[PDB]
């Protein structure tokens, strides 16, 4: 009949969040219904909360884009799933709730070894990382990568994936308060460096990843994620990346599934592993967001739907 | 020995600033070799050098040209791997339009016996540009689609041939309609330059293409597509697109990537030997006829490369 959900009453600060009961959605054709066990907290959720969003959706709204759980009901015309299957999923909002309906093309079966909390930490960070390194840039042996915010979710995803390719040097920057916790992830770590990087690699780096130029080698790539004659003259590449838009506006679910299958292969070979920081109740969402604002987390924050506060 | 003949650019300006003259034969420094030139490539950049559109411009008088082929006539001190009589093609930082050229050995490549001197002078600029754009800037793979502007030009034809080495690649070309009968078999679909091909492409592929190659001489891109220009950042984020610029000469002579380029040339030569690629030569010109050849490139009248052939009588 009804479910519990986190509701953003309107745009503003933390105190616009509510926990309310609402109608359980039912799966339309080509959707399935997920009994949610965990939800990913992403930086973009803080932006949605303030209304710093392109074409902001109407409030009130249930936030969240990433979740894991158990298939509880099938929509018409769904291939490949049975109720009781364990899955992770993307969803265009509405993830922060006990039940979620989403089109099947955004749903991925998870291995038995993968817990729900890990699974809800898996898709946003690792797909973003994988797509930037191997689909936007073409990371190969011997290259070097500069990763800003090396301690963040995507930063850590990038560092693990780089280690699957031989002889890749990863340069990270981060809050100097974070260095002891993240130092073992990267080859060289800096305290927020151009000179310091140049001292190890005179020409700079092959790939720079920068979240919401002069550091690039020739043929290098700068990628921004969530003067054209200069590019010609300097032989450089600039790119932008928004996983949500790729999914929900541009129709590339099929491609992303390819990426998720490769990510799951790597996970099964024990070459990558999402790092969950802490598990938070639905009542504790304000506190979790605050912790992300205060940059106090080492790993991913995860909402545990069945946790009591 | 005696002085050699060369094309000199007297000063920047129009065609009439180009003349033939005699010059001191250069000798090879350490790590250089000396090449007896048989043919030279004409490139669009040569027209720009002629007007002084190059920031920052070299001093005049000067001998133009960046691409040549010929016979190794002498070795400089540091050099191994070559013998006199070796047939080669080579990049050279100006000074190619002369009977003799000296250039650092990292810019020289041995050519196969099957390859004529005119083909060889047609080979490096166009085919290395094509290769680097498709496989180093973009990462062309099976099933993708490419839009090539000026499909009849040297680079354009090199791009079509290289796409055909990768399975199931759909190549869209634009070109003037009088060229269409001669180049139609080199691409999958060919469109009129001055029509509105955007619609014509979209009618075959609603989403557009994976790679757009646009010369110095956006709305078309699929998600994750790459637009490359060769010789608003929140929009890129929102639309998931890639923009690149490419200048082979800068890569060679300013940025130090001779090693990489040699890798590309070795793979290009492997393809040539397997008969998968072959330079398309538009016309051969005498050294005296350089003005008329430049005019033809300006008038976009060529299909493939224009070559200055040193032993051709005017």
UniProtKB/Swiss-Prot annotation, chain B:
Detected in skin fibroblasts. Transmembrane segments: none annotated. Its EC number is 1.-.-.-. It is an enzyme of class 1 (oxidoreductase). It comes from the Eukaryota. One of its GO terms (molecular function) is zinc ion binding. Keywords: Oxidoreductase, Phosphoprotein. Belongs to the zinc-containing alcohol dehydrogenase family. Quinone oxidoreductase subfamily. This is Synaptic vesicle membrane protein VAT-1 homolog-like. It comes from Homo sapiens.
């Amino acid at each position: 009949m009804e479910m519990r959900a986190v509701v953003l009453a309107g745009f503003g600060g933390l105190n616009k969040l509510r926990l309310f009961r609402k109608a359980m959605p039912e799966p339309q054709d080509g959707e399935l219904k997920i009994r949610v066990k965990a939800c990913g907290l992403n930086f973009i959720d803080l932006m949605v909360r303030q209304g710093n969003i392109d074409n902001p959706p109407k409030t009130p709204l249930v936030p969240g884009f990433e979740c894991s759980g158990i298939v509880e009901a099938l929509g018409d015309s769904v291939k490949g799933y049975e109720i009781g299957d364990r899955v992770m999923a993307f969803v265009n909002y509405n993830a922060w709730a006990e039940v979620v309906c989403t089109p099947v093309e955004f749903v991925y079966k998870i291995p038995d070894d993968m817990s729900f909390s890990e699974a809800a930490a898996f898709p946003m960070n690792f797909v973003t990382a994988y797509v930037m390194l191997f689909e936007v840039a073409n990371l190969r042996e011997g290259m070097s990568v500069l990763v800003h915010s090396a301690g963040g979710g995507v930063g850590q995803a990038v560092a693990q994936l780089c280690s699957t390719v031989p002889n890749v040097t990863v340069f990270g920057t981060a809050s100097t308060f974070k260095h002891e916790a993240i130092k073992d992830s990267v080859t060289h770590l800096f305290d927020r460096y151009v000179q310091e990087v140049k001292r190890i690699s005179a020409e700079g780096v092959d790939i720079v990843l920068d979240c919401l130029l002069s550091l690039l080698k020739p043929l290098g790539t700068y990628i921004l994620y969530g003067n054209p004659i200069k590019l010609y003259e300097e032989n450089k590449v600039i790119a932008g990346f928004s996983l949500l838009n790729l999914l929900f506006k541009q129709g590339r679910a099929g491609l992303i599934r390819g990426v998720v299958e490769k990510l799951i292969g790597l996970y099964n070979q024990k070459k990558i592993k999402p790092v969950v920081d802490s598990l938070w109740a639905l009542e504790e969402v304000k506190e979790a967001m605050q912790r992300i604002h205060d940059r106090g987390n080492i790993g991913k924050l995860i909402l545990d739907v069945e946790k009591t506060p």
